[PDB]
């Protein structure tokens, strides 16, 4: 190196070029994958991460762990990106994608070191991934009769399998049934915003409940609220977007008078406007009144005098769920409160839930929404419970959209590895080594399951390989029995699209990482 | 190792002379520290007694700006002289950073400082004006730049006219 | 920090194993680019402007500043290989690092390190046995061509590789010159008795092999002759200066008349010693000690060459070659001071030769024994230093070939054959040691891979073809002659290296395998590291 | 006797931070070295076997791609000569859309050979004159090297085959699928009128399902939600309003002056009645989808919900204009009900989610419309950005084909033929310009050399084979990528073709940049000072 009188790029620019760059990229990907290695399978653990502010997060989800990591390596960020991709499109398998991509890169690292051209490796990954995706599609088990009970069992088993890796795995049956019941009530779009999730401190996990309606926390009651009755046996609910308070008619409104009689008339007119709104609400027959905008103390006392329930500053999502459950409409004007815009729930009640007051709208027969009330001993406990419930809900939604399943526990991975190896025996040989490396990398999942469970991965992998060779496409790792078993008969079921997306994303990430030969880092701005 | 309730008692009242002398010296350093801290960190991130008692004095209704310099400083000094000739009501002045003893970062990367004081508070803390003003712009450019923010204020006698309260009385 | 309460950092489990493997890989990759004929030399700067252009692995690893102790372990491994063999210094480091990397990869699969170590030991033993039984060529059926080819193979990748046709001949002649037998009749070749002198100037072709000995010394005085046509060499181990009385003796004068006589005798003692030495007819006087002006004048008047401050090893070699006797003192068993002609070494001619503005002593054609010396000429000092290092490597290789009369095919043929044989053999030994031996066989393939990748060629295809050839040789008894098929990096195709004249001493491969296996075993034992903070 | 004083004159009057490079060795050679360095940095990304580069800009945003223009844009080039060559590359990108790396490589080779010519004895004037003569000769030759023409642009298979080569350098593994997508998207646009608008192609990046799930949509897709409770319309009659969906207000100052209790009690009721009347008048025209460019009032939203009207709020004016073009509506400036002509029509408007992103889709069932959208899927943001760059290259290639339908063989065949014929021409030319002409011809070898180097084969064998074949008479023969050894094949049969106009503009711009760099003799650089942007 010699000092040019005028340098080409900006001073401080760092450039890494050649095989060492790609080897370093593979090593960085391995380092990132190691951070979520132990959070796989029913014997997986949790990670605690403390941010700069001192707040701590505890999660078994791979995508959350990767996001909370401040990854700055350009090649390593692809793993976080594909984890986020798997979370967004599917919601489960955010650890499998990273493990598979890192295993692909580790398997092809020795061939990269030998000087093999990366285009060949990319082509081999594309071919192997296409073959594996086709195999998954054409061996996935589906039932073409769509009975309600069989679909219920399939969804419950899928939710149980998705949930049997978190701290709620002990109550996985209860939560799986709750998830299936919650999902079935969504009408056609299965919006996540239509499934409320409320976290209340104090209580066992078994105390968590799913309400066939809506529920939200009490919102800053004014004076005179305690005099209102707190239970109705057939209430009519007025869903409103109205500020019921004494206030200026408009921000720019100005009143100009020159007579004390006009002054008194103006005061009485403001009072009459408020009382006219209140009377219009009351004469509609409604007994429970909810509003986005604040409800003043005067209106609260007025409703108390009429044996009515009022609640102001209700959040937008809560009112949307209440409208979808009771079956009304959010009215910004109270001039036409017809009977067809009023909600109707069987029972409304305010109850004490773990040191907090919640309003319950139960008994809705045609409700298209639901609310989860999760109990726990700590904030992070509740957050991890919510994450697990979200994973289960996403899995159940995908299974509803497409009910094709493959036995889990690495059975599908081992079958794909066997098929890809057998294909690799019948090609000239340059691509054969790469396809065999891909097939061997497909074995990371059962090996990681055995390692996390504390088994001897070598013997279990040998038994699985022999079993798959001699027949049986649904044989995977049996964690409880220290051995292998038919996972399909053990109801270890996951949707086929989960593995399809995992393989596709891992292959794309590996191809992108390998394709790069040189990196440039411009100086800090 | 006991007697945590020391109750120094007569001590502080018997040695109050040295304590008050040290307190006075520390407070004297404290006004300087408070004055200098208004520039560093507050705007840098985004004799000294003469400066202190010059800032403390004079009317709050007159805008007074000071310049921090080290030995294009000459061009900005010339522009400042031109503005002083154009704005006699203002009291333009400059002072070295080493006299104030500011931080090393201010000395190394904040040599051009346009500090404006109005009634003891900083209404303008233009620091390192090289980028947004230039290196060789004239006095009119600086005047326009400062007047765009509404900070600077909006015949000639022979030489002088000024010199009991009995002005003139012809009453018998 | 914690319950252990030790003032130092600690690493446990896979972390320390990964650190050790990374250090080994770093050391391997430092010198991996300098292996094989298509390898390239390296340029080292010693922080004060000193430049050391070199290709030897031992020199590279010794000159570097190494902090991680596994990296050190590899460095002294290379140094040990250099001291005990003289060749294969880069190969042993590369093999050891690859062995460690694959052993750690096995360990990460929950394979216990004891099984990996046992498999490595068994694989090394079987590889040594297979090499000694199947992959050796006896040099008694070749003669001098085997020595020439071994020297040329050693010289490949060095700054004298292209000039091998001449350098190998010079090295073979020099080694054969210093050959002598000892007790029990075994002929041993004392390399490092061939003095190597570096002097820039003319091209490499003008490097000359002296049929005698070359001294990096000049005559003491300008008056004495600089050429003797019949040398009578007398080697002395004592200085010839004015005689100074010992520490325990003092001269106390009470009669003034004795001082002049004492002062005269003080130099007459040395004068008498020099006259005794010269009376026997000696023409060349070499001494390890200094010589002052009066003794130089005496030698000049006698018309005899005198050299002072001669190195002790050079003096010993001259005495052995010319038949002279080292005399640390002039004192016989009769209590007198005498010098006999029986201690006079004889040489055909001694010349004060001039080499590139400097002068040196050439002792040509010593009798009663034949000695050799090499003077290397190059563009500058760095080139001469690299020439000397490569020359020493070639001399060591020729020594090994002449001592042990067995050679092995070069160009990675031995590595490929060993990989095939060990991969086949691993299936009949244990359960996890099977995997250990398979990993050993795979790790042995790094040498041909590095040789191929250094030539910017398709390493995968070349190694696959080599493995196919060796497998066909092993499984087919009638095709047993394919064991010699190695790598031809000039054309990038397999080639019969035994026919092509690419040979290496068997001891090189055997010692490399043993040392690499032991180093890998030593490193693999570590599962925890305590790094105490320095007291300062 | 220990210091060298500055020479009297200009050296002493120079500013403290300024630099002055004058003469051949101090200025021209340094500029040529800088340009060669830039070409070296960008060279490895050339051709289908080119490699992506992860470039992190000063804002710490990761760019991974092999597009030369993008790489040069993200790099912080400082040397003025390299800056000029980068400007030439950007000009080529703006004018045509592909060939930027060709421009950079050709300029670097030309400047290297110009430095060689200066070293052997030729002056700058002779080199410049020879380069200009050879550039004119190449421009004259190029029309004779056209192998075939598009001859049809309304077809799908023909357009896909034509566009495959352009998007073969980028995304080498899967180019047929992207070619088909871009061909369909471009055929939907480009009606019987010969004008084709590049901006009419819209790319929407939805993350999650891999790039193999990408598809083309005849309409618009916006990544947002609907204000109202209506989320699907089957016979949409979009009415577009640029004004906010709220009651119009004065411009100076609106003060509600109340002087009696009756006005105070009736003001809000009258305002609500007026808003309801306006919304009902809008809905009575049959319009069932309303798109606004401003905010949506609560009362207006309530009355839209009451009359079953879908509300979509577009924030950017560009999106509003594009939606108006797609649907066929007019952006009304007031809340008046639209006339029949200003009323837009769409086959279907609905709310849907792709992956985890809620989008509003304006879908046309017909295979027509002014604007077509390409929905790009993927597992990474950077991958989708690279696919979008490839789509932009393909669309620019289609636009160039619309402008000029002539094509020339690819794979360096055109470059080899140009080099051979320019070398033949330079032999007949006497004088000192023959050396410059021959060097200009030899500079065309940098393209096949770069292709051979990237593909992993020896470049010299490929060059010798190409010269032998072109001397035989085959002018449509280039190097074969799908070969482990140096080999050649006919490009016309393989369909590896690049646009004639792109080659012409690239050669012209590269030659202009090279000669302009050569013309500089002295450099007077000021103090860098500041100027972050
Ligand atoms: N009961 C079980 N027995 C064996 N394997 C299981 C069981 N439940 C889950 N697994 C496996 O554990 C793997 C990881 O699943 P999980 O940790 O729930 O989410 P992620 O895939 O995001 O890590 C899945 O691939 C699945 O095959
Ligand atoms: N002419 C040749 N052709 C093919 N291979 C060779 C040739 N000469 C040496 N080799 C091989 O190159 C390898 C590298 O040797 P080298 O690196 O020079 O020794 P060291 O490791 O002591 O530096 C040796 O193992 C040898 O087998
Ligand atoms: N399949 C192919 N085989 C051989 N050469 C090709 C192929 N596809 C494209 N090329 C060549 O690659 C060149 C395009 O390089 P590219 O990376 O697009 O640079 P630029 O973007 O500057 O045009 C074309 O000149 C063409 O000849
Ligand atoms: Mg899961
Ligand atoms: Mg050697
Ligand atoms: Mg292009």
Interval between CA D168 and ligand 6 midpoint (Å): 8
Specify burial of residue B27 (Cβ count, 10 A radius: 0-12, 13-18, 19+). Answer: exposed
A61 catalytically annotated = yes
H-helix or E-strand containing D317?
A: helix D317-327
In Å, how far are C83, C118, C137, C138, C423 from C132, measured between CA atoms? 22, 21, 10, 11, 18
D378–A255 C-beta distance less than 8 A: no
Query: Residue D48: helix, strand or coil by DSSP?
Result: coil
Burial D417-455 (b: 16+ CB within 10 A, else e): bbbbbbbebbeebeebbbbbbbbbbbbbbbbbbbbbbbb
| Residue spans of beta strands (DSSP E) within D263-346 | 289-292, 310-313
Q: Give the phi and the psi of residue D392 in degrees, each rounded to 5.
A: -60, -40
Handedness of CA D321, D323, D328, D332 (dihedral sign): negative
Pairing relation of β-strands D201-205 and D372-376? parallel
CB proximity list for D228: less than 8 A, separation 6 or greater: D301, D304, D305, D309, D310, D311
Handedness of CA D240, D244, D250, D255 (dihedral sign): positive
In Å, how far are B75, B112, B129, D9 from B134, measured between CA atoms? 10, 11, 7, 27
All residues of chain A having their beta carbon less than 8 Å from the beta carbon of residue D272 are 333, 335
CB of A517 within 8 Å of a chain D CB? The answer is: yes
- What is the end-to-end Cα distance of chain D in Å, rounded? 46
Nearest alpha carbon to residue C386 among C507, C191, C394: C394
What span, in angstroms and rounded, lies between the C-alpha atoms of C485 and C498?
8
- What is the end-to-end Cα distance of chain B in Å, rounded? 95
Nearest alpha carbon to residue B65 among B122, B103, B133: B122
Query: Residue A76: helix, strand or coil by DSSP?
Result: coil
Give me the residue label for tokens 């009755």: A229
Q: How is B94-163 classified by DSSP, letter by letter?
A: EEEHHHHT--HHHHHH--SEEEEEETTEEEEEEE-THHHH-SS--HHHHHHHHHTTT-S-----SS----
Nearest alpha carbon to residue A88 among D384, D173, D311, D218: D384
H-helix or E-strand containing C351?
A: strand C345-355
In Å, how far are A60, A61, C30, D52, D376 from A93, measured between CA atoms? 11, 9, 40, 28, 23
Burial D103-115 (b: 16+ CB within 10 A, else e): bbbbbbbbbbbbb
Give me the residue label for tokens 């320019």: D422
CB-ligand 2 contact for C89 (6 Å cutoff) = yes
All residues of chain D having their beta carbon less than 8 Å from the beta carbon of residue A516 are 51-54, 64
CB-ligand 2 contact for C157 (6 Å cutoff) = yes
All residues of chain D having their beta carbon less than 8 Å from the beta carbon of residue A330 are 302, 305
- What is the DSSP-derived secondary structure letter of residue D307? T
- What is the DSSP-derived secondary structure letter of residue D10? H
H-helix or E-strand containing B66?
A: strand B64-69
Cβ pair C82, C393 in contact under 8 A = no
Please state at what angle helix D176-188 crosses helix D157-166, rounded to 10 degrees: 120
Q: Is D458 left (phi over 0), alpha (psi -120 to 50) or beta?
A: beta
What span, in angstroms and rounded, lies between the C-alpha atoms of D385 and D383?
5
What span, in angstroms and rounded, lies between the C-alpha atoms of D254 and D261?
20
Where helices occur in D142-290 by DSSP H, the ranges are: 157-166, 176-188, 261-283
Beta bridge partners of D63: D55
- What is the DSSP-derived secondary structure letter of residue A242? -
Cβ pair D230, D308 in contact under 8 A = yes
Count CB-CB contacts under 10 A for residue A435. Answer: 20
Closest Cα of chain A to C20: distance in Å?
15
What span, in angstroms and rounded, lies between the C-alpha atoms of A409 and A41?
8
Give the largest CA-CA distance in chain C. Answer: 103
Query: Residue A50: helix, strand or coil by DSSP?
Result: strand
Count CB-CB contacts under 10 A for residue D489. Answer: 18
The ligand 2 atom nearest the CA atom of C154: 18
Q: How is A107-153 classified by DSSP, letter by letter?
A: HHHHHHHTT--HHHHHHHHHHHHHHHHHHHHHH-B--TT--HHHHHH
Cβ pair A190, A155 in contact under 8 A = no
What span, in angstroms and rounded, lies between the C-alpha atoms of D170 and D50?
8
A430–C460 C-beta distance less than 8 A: yes
- Rounded to 5°, angle at Cα D392 from D391 and D398: 90
What span, in angstroms and rounded, lies between the C-alpha atoms of D96 and D68?
14
C114 catalytically annotated = no
What span, in angstroms and rounded, lies between the C-alpha atoms of D166 and D181?
14
What span, in angstroms and rounded, lies between the C-alpha atoms of D77 and A9?
4
Give me the torsion for CA of A119, A122, A127, A133, rounded to 10°: -170
> Annotated catalytic residue: which of C82, C104, C385, C393?
C393
H-helix or E-strand containing B49?
A: helix B48-56
C90 catalytically annotated = yes
Beta bridge partners of C408: C504
> Residue D484 is encoded by which pair of tokens?
């482990």
Interval between CA D117 and ligand 5 midpoint (Å): 44
Pairing relation of β-strands D19-22 and C485-488? unpaired
B–D interface: beta-carbon pairs under 8 A: 6
CB-ligand 3 contact for D42 (6 Å cutoff) = no
All residues of chain D having their beta carbon less than 8 Å from the beta carbon of residue B130 are 529-530
Nearest alpha carbon to residue D222 among D297, D314, D131, D153: D314
Q: How is C119-145 classified by DSSP, letter by letter?
A: HHHHHHHHHHHHHHHHS-EEGGGTTTH
Q: Give the phi and the psi of residue C314 in degrees, each rounded to 5.
A: -60, -40
Count CB-CB contacts under 10 A for residue D505. Answer: 19
Give the largest CA-CA distance in chain B. Answer: 95
> Residue A210 is encoded by which pair of tokens?
């799913």
Experimental method: cryo-EM
Interval between CA C411 and ligand 2 midpoint (Å): 6
What span, in angstroms and rounded, lies between the C-alpha atoms of B101 and B36?
9
What span, in angstroms and rounded, lies between the C-alpha atoms of D117 and A267?
97
> Residue B30 is encoded by which pair of tokens?
């404290």
**After which residues, if any, is chain B broken (C to N > 2.5 Å)?**
46, 71, 154, 163
Pocket test of ligand 1: the residue of A36, A40, A166, A407 to mutate, having most ligand atoms within 8 Å of its CB, is A40
Q: How is C445-468 classified by DSSP, letter by letter?
A: THHHHHHHHHTTS-HHHHHHHHHH
* Helices and strands (DSSP H and E) totals, chain A: 16, 20
Count CB-CB contacts under 10 A for residue C532. Answer: 10
Give me the residue label for tokens 């009530």: A185
- What is the DSSP-derived secondary structure letter of residue D26? I
Cβ pair A18, A522 in contact under 8 A = no
- What is the DSSP-derived secondary structure letter of residue B26? H
Touching chains, A (3+ CB pairs < 8 A): C, D
Interval between CA B75 and ligand 5 midpoint (Å): 70
Q: Give the phi and the psi of residue D62 in degrees, each rounded to 5.
A: -85, 125
Atom 15 in ligand 3: residue holding the nearest Cα = D47
Cβ pair C324, C233 in contact under 8 A = yes
What span, in angstroms and rounded, lies between the C-alpha atoms of C78 and C93?
6
Nearest alpha carbon to residue A453 among A430, A479, A435: A479
Q: Give the phi and the psi of residue A210 in degrees, each rounded to 5.
A: -115, 125
> Annotated catalytic residue: which of C59, C90, C270, C288?
C90
Give me the residue label for tokens 């390898």: C39
> Residue A158 is encoded by which pair of tokens?
């899928």
Handedness of CA C396, C401, C403, C408 (dihedral sign): positive
Nearest alpha carbon to residue C219 among C363, C327, C347: C363
H-helix or E-strand containing A515?
A: helix A496-515
Closest Cα of chain B to D12: distance in Å?
19
What span, in angstroms and rounded, lies between the C-alpha atoms of A25 and A513?
7
What span, in angstroms and rounded, lies between the C-alpha atoms of A293 and A331?
12
In Å, how far are A287, A395, C62, C146 from A369, measured between CA atoms? 22, 18, 74, 90
CB-ligand 2 contact for C90 (6 Å cutoff) = yes
In Å, how far are A436, A450, A453, A487, D264 from A409, measured between CA atoms? 21, 10, 12, 7, 72
> Annotated catalytic residue: which of A39, A64, A78, A94?
A94
Q: How is D165-196 classified by DSSP, letter by letter?
A: HHTTSSS-SS-HHHHHHHHHHHHHSS-SSS--
What span, in angstroms and rounded, lies between the C-alpha atoms of C296 and C220?
7
Nearest alpha carbon to residue D42 among D87, D95, D85, D104: D104
CB proximity list for D503: less than 8 A, separation 6 or greater: D99, D102, D142, D408, D414
Query: Which A positions 119-178 lie with beta carbon below 8 A of chain D?
Result: 119, 122-123, 126
> Annotated catalytic residue: which of A39, A57, A64, A95?
A95
What span, in angstroms and rounded, lies between the C-alpha atoms of C213 and C364?
6
Please state at what angle helix A94-113 crosses helix A496-515, rounded to 10 degrees: 40
The ligand 3 atom nearest the CA atom of D502: 23
Nearest alpha carbon to residue C286 among C298, C301, C304: C304
What span, in angstroms and rounded, lies between the C-alpha atoms of A30 and B157?
86
In Å, how far are A140, A258, D292 from D360, measured between CA atoms? 33, 55, 14
> Residue B28 is encoded by which pair of tokens?
């004297």
What span, in angstroms and rounded, lies between the C-alpha atoms of C456 and C458?
7
What span, in angstroms and rounded, lies between the C-alpha atoms of D284 and D281?
5
Cβ pair A341, A286 in contact under 8 A = no
All residues of chain B having their beta carbon less than 8 Å from the beta carbon of residue D530 are 130-131
CB-ligand 3 contact for D392 (6 Å cutoff) = no
Query: Which A positions 238-257 lie with beta carbon below 8 A of chain D?
Result: 241, 249-250, 252-257
Interval between CA C154 and ligand 5 midpoint (Å): 5
Handedness of CA C461, C465, C470, C475 (dihedral sign): positive
What span, in angstroms and rounded, lies between the C-alpha atoms of D60 and D82?
23
Nearest alpha carbon to residue D213 among D361, D331, D378: D378
> Residue D444 is encoded by which pair of tokens?
């065309």
Query: Residue D144: helix, strand or coil by DSSP?
Result: helix
Specify burial of residue B31 (Cβ count, 10 A radius: 0-12, 13-18, 19+). Answer: middle
Nearest alpha carbon to residue C219 among C323, C308, C104, C130: C308
Pairing relation of β-strands A47-50 and A56-59? antiparallel
What span, in angstroms and rounded, lies between the C-alpha atoms of D222 and C221?
101
Burial D120-137 (b: 16+ CB within 10 A, else e): eebebebbbbbbbbbbeb
> Residue D498 is encoded by which pair of tokens?
């690049």
Burial C195-215 (b: 16+ CB within 10 A, else e): bbbbbbeeebeebbbbbbbbb
In Å, how far are B39, B117, B125 from B55, measured between CA atoms? 14, 8, 15
Atom 13 in ligand 2: residue holding the nearest Cα = C36
Chain A: residue whose CA lies nearest to C30: A20
What span, in angstroms and rounded, lies between the C-alpha atoms of D46 and D42?
8
What is the radius of gyration, based on Cα positions, of chain C? 30
Cβ pair D73, D55 in contact under 8 A = no
Give me the residue label for tokens 């609640």: A311
What span, in angstroms and rounded, lies between the C-alpha atoms of D392 and D206?
17
Handedness of CA D86, D87, D88, D94 (dihedral sign): positive
Q: Give the phi and the psi of residue C208 in degrees, each rounded to 5.
A: -120, 145
Beta bridge partners of B116: B65, B124
What span, in angstroms and rounded, lies between the C-alpha atoms of C377 and C379?
7
| Residue spans of beta strands (DSSP E) within A402-500 | 405-407, 475-478, 483-486, 493-495
What span, in angstroms and rounded, lies between the C-alpha atoms of C50 and C56?
17
């Amino acid at each position: 190196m010699m000092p040019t009188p005028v340098i080409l790029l900006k001073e401080g620019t760092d450039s890494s070029q050649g095989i060492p760059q790609l080897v370093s990229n593979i090593s960085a990907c391995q380092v990132i994958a190691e951070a979520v290695r132990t959070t796989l399978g029913p014997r997986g653990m949790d990670k605690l991460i403390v941010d700069g502010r001192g707040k701590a997060t505890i999660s078994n989800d791979g995508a959350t762990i990767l996001k909370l990591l401040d990854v700055v390596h350009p090649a390593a960020k692809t793993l976080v990106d594909i984890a986020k991709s798997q979370d967004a499109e599917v919601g489960d398998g955010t650890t499998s994608v990273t493990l598979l991509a890192a295993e692909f890169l580790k398997q092809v690292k020795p061939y990269v070191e030998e000087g093999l051209h990366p285009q060949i490796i990319i082509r081999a990954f594309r071919t192997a991934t296409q073959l594996a995706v086709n195999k998954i599609k054409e061996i996935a088990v589906t039932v073409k009769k769509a009975d309600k009970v069989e679909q219920r069992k399939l969804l419950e088993k899928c939710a149980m399998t998705a949930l049997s890796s978190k701290l709620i795995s002990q109550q996985k049956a209860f939560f799986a049934k709750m998830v299936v019941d919650a999902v079935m009530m969504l009408d056609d779009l299965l919006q996540l915003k239509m499934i409320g999730i409320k976290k209340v401190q104090g209580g066992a996990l078994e105390d968590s409940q799913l309400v066939a309606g809506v529920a939200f926390k009490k919102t800053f009651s004014y004076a005179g609220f305690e005099m209102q009755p707190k239970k109705y046996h057939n209430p009519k609910i007025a869903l409103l977007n109205v500020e019921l308070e004494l206030k200026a008619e408009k921000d720019n409104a100005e009143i100009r008078v020159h007579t004390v009689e006009d002054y008194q008339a103006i005061v009485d007119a403001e009072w009459n406007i408020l009382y006219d709104k209140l009377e219009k609400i009351h004469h509609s027959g409604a007994k429970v009144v909810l509003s986005k905008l604040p409800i003043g103390d005067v209106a609260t006392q007025y409703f108390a005098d009429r044996d009515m329930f009022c609640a102001g500053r209700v959040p937008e999502e809560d009112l949307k769920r209440t409208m979808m459950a009771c079956g009304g409409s959010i009215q910004t004007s109270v001039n036409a409160l017809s009977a067809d815009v009023l909600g109707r729930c069987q029972v409304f009640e305010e109850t004490q839930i773990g040191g907090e007051r919640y309003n319950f709208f139960t008994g809705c027969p045609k409700a298209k929404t639901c609310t989860f009330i999760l109990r726990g001993g700590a904030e992070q406990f509740m957050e991890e419970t919510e994450r697990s419930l979200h994973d289960a809900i996403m899995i159940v939604r995908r299974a509803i959209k497409n009910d094709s399943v493959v036995a889990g526990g690495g059975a599908i991975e081992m079958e794909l590895s066997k098929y890809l190896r057998d294909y690799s025996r019948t090609i000239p040989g340059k691509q054969q080594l790469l396809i065999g490396a891909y097939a061997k990398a497909l074995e990371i999942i059962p090996r990681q399951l055995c390692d996390n469970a504390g088994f001897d991965a070598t013997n279990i992998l040998n038994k699985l390989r022999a079993r798959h060779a001699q027949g049986g496409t649904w044989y995977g790792v049996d964690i409880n029995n220290e051995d292998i078993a038919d996972n399909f008969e053990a109801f270890v079921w996951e949707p086929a699209m989960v593995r399809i997306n995992a393989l596709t994303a891992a292959s794309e990430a590996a191809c992108l990482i390998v394709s790069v030969d040189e990196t440039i880092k411009n100086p800090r701005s | 190792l006991a007697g945590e309730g020391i109750s120094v008692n007569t001590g502080p009242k018997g040695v109050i002379n040295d304590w008050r002398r040290f307190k006075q010296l520390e407070t004297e350093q404290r006004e300087e520290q408070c004055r200098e801290m208004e520039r560093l960190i507050k705007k840098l991130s985004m004799s000294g007694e003469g400066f202190l008692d010059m800032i403390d004095k004079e009317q709050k209704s007159i805008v007074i700006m000071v310049h921090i310099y080290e030995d294009g400083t000459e061009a900005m000094n010339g522009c400042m002289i031109c503005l002083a000739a154009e704005y006699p009501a203002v009291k333009f002045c400059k002072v070295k950073s080493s006299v104030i003893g500011a931080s090393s970062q201010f000395t190394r990367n904040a040599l051009p400082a346009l500090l404006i004081y109005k009634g003891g508070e900083l209404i303008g803390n233009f620091v390192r004006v090289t980028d947004q003003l230039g290196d060789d712009f004239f006095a009119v450019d600086l005047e326009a730049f400062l007047q765009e923010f509404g900070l600077l204020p909006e015949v000639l006698t022979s030489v002088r006219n000024s010199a009991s309260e009995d002005s003139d009385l012809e009453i018998d | 920090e914690g319950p252990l309460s030790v003032f130092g950092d600690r690493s446990t489990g896979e972390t320390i194993r990964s650190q050790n493997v990374m250090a080994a890989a770093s050391i391997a990759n430092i010198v991996k680019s300098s292996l094989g004929p298509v390898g390239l030399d390296k340029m080292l700067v010693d922080d004060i402007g000193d430049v050391t252009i070199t290709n030897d692995g031992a020199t590279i690893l010794k000159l570097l500043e190494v902090e991680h102790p596994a990296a050190k372990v590899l460095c002294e491994l290379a140094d040990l290989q250099d001291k005990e063999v003289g060749d294969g210094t880069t190969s042993v480091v590369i093999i050891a690092a690859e062995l460690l990397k694959n052993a750690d990869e096995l360990v990460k699969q929950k394979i216990h390190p004891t099984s990996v170590i046992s498999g490595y030991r068994l694989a090394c033993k079987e590889a040594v046995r297979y090499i000694n039984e199947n992959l050796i060529v006896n040099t008694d059926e070749l003669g001098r061509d085997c020595l020439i080819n071994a020297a040329k193979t050693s010289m490949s990748s060095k700054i004298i590789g292209i000039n091998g046709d001449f350098f190998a001949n010079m090295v073979v002649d020099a080694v054969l010159a210093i050959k002598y037998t000892d007790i029990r009749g075994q002929p041993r070749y004392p390399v490092n008795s061939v003095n190597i002198l570096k002097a820039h100037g003319r091209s490499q072709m003008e490097s000359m092999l002296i049929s005698g000995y070359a001294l990096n010394c000049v005559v003491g005085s300008q008056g004495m002759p600089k050429r003797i046509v019949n040398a009578k060499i007398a080697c002395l181990d004592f200085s010839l200066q004015k005689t100074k009385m010992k520490l325990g003796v003092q001269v106390v004068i009470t009669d003034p008349e004795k001082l002049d006589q004492i002062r005269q005798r003080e130099s007459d003692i040395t004068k008498e010693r020099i006259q005794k030495i010269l009376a026997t007819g000696a023409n060349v006087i070499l001494t390890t000690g200094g010589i002052d002006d009066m003794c130089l004048k005496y030698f000049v008047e006698a018309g005899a060459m005198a050299v002072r401050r001669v190195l002790k090893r050079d003096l010993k070699r001259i005495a052995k070659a010319s038949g002279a006797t080292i005399l640390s003192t002039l004192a016989n068993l009769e209590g007198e001071e005498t010098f006999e002609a029986a201690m006079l070494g004889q040489a055909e001619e001694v010349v004060q030769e001039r080499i590139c503005d400097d002068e040196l002593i050439l002792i040509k054609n010593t009798k009663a024994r034949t000695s050799a010396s090499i003077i290397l000429r190059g563009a500058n000092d760095f080139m001469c230093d690299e020439m000397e290092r490569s020359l020493h490597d070639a001399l060591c290789v020729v020594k090994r070939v002449l001592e042990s009369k067995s050679v092995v095919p070069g160009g990675g043929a031995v590595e490929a054959a060993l990989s095939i044989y060990l991969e086949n053999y691993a299936t009949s030994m244990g359960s996890r040691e099977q995997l250990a031996i398979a990993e050993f066989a795979r790790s042995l393939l790094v040498i041909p891979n590095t040789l191929a990748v250094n030539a910017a060629q398709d390493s995968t295809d070349l190694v696959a073809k080599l493995r196919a050839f060796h497998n066909e040789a092993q499984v087919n008894p009638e095709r047993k002659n394919l064991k010699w098929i190695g790598l031809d990096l000039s054309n990038g195709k397999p080639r019969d290296n035994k026919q092509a004249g690419v040979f290496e001493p068997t001891i090189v491969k055997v010692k490399s395998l043993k040392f690499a296996t032991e180093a890998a075993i030593t490193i693999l034992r570590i599962d925890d590291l305590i790094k105490l903070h320095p007291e300062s | 006797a220990l210091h060298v004083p500055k020479a009297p004159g200009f050296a002493q009057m120079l500013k403290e931070g300024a630099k002055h490079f004058s003469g051949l060795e101090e200025a021209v050679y340094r500029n040529i070295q800088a340009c060669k360095e830039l070409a070296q940095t960008t060279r490895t990304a050339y051709g289908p076997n080119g490699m992506n580069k992860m470039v992190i800009n000063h804002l710490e945003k990761l760019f991974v791609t092999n597009d030369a223009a993008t790489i040069l844009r993200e790099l912080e080039v400082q040397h003025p000569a390299a800056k000029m060559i980068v400007m030439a590359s950007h000009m080529q990108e703006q004018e045509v859309g592909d060939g930027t790396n060709f421009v950079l490589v050709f300029a670097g080779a030309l400047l290297e050979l110009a430095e060689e010519l200066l070293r052997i004895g030729l002056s700058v004037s002779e080199v410049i004159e020879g380069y200009e003569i050879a550039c004119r000769k190449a421009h004259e030759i190029l029309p004779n090297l056209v192998c075939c023409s598009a001859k049809n642009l309304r077809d799908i298979d023909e357009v896909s085959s034509l566009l495959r080569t352009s998007i073969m350098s980028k995304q080498y593994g899967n180019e047929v699928f992207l070619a088909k997508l871009i061909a369909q998207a471009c055929v939907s646009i480009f009606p019987d009128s010969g004008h084709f608008n590049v901006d009419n192609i819209r790319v929407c990046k939805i993350l999650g399902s891999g790039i193999s799930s990408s598809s083309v949509l005849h309409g618009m897709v916006f990544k947002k939600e609907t204000e109202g409770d209506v989320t699907s319309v089957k016979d949409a009659k979009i009415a577009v309003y640029s004004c906010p969906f709220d009651g119009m207000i004065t411009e100076t100052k609106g003060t509600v002056l109340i002087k009696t209790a009756e006005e105070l009690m009736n003001f809000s009721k009258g305002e609500e009645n007026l808003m309801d009347a306006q919304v009902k008048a809008i809905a009575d025209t049959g319009a069932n989808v309303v798109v606004t460019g401003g905010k949506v009032a609560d009362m207006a939203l309530h009355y839209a919900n009451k009359y079953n009207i879908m509300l979509v709020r577009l924030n950017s004016k560009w999106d509003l204009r594009r939606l108006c073009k797609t649907v066929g509506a007019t952006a009304l400036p007031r809340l008046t009900p639209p006339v029949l002509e200003e009323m837009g029509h769409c086959d279907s408007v609905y709310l849907s989610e792709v992956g985890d992103t809620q989008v509003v889709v304006f879908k046309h069932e017909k295979e027509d419309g002014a604007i077509s959208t390409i929905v790009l899927r993927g597992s990474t943001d950077n991958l989708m950005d690279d696919i979008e760059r490839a789509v932009d290259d393909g669309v620019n290639t289609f636009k160039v084909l619309t402008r000029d339908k002539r094509l020339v063989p690819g794979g360096g065949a055109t470059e080899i033929e140009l080099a051979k014929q320019i070398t033949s021409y330079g032999e007949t030319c006497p004088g000192l310009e023959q050396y410059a002409i021959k060097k200009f011809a030899e500079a065309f070898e940098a393209i096949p050399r770069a292709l051979a180097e990237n593909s992993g084969v020896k470049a010299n064998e490929v060059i010798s084979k190409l010269y032998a074949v072109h001397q035989e008479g085959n002018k449509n023969v280039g190097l074969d990528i799908e070969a482990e050894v140096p080999a050649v094949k006919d490009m016309l049969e393989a369909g590896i073709l690049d646009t004639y106009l792109g080659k012409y503009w690239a050669i012209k711009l590269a030659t202009n940049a090279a000669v302009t760099v050569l013309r500089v003799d002295q450099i007077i650089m000021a103090k860098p000072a500041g100027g972050p942007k």
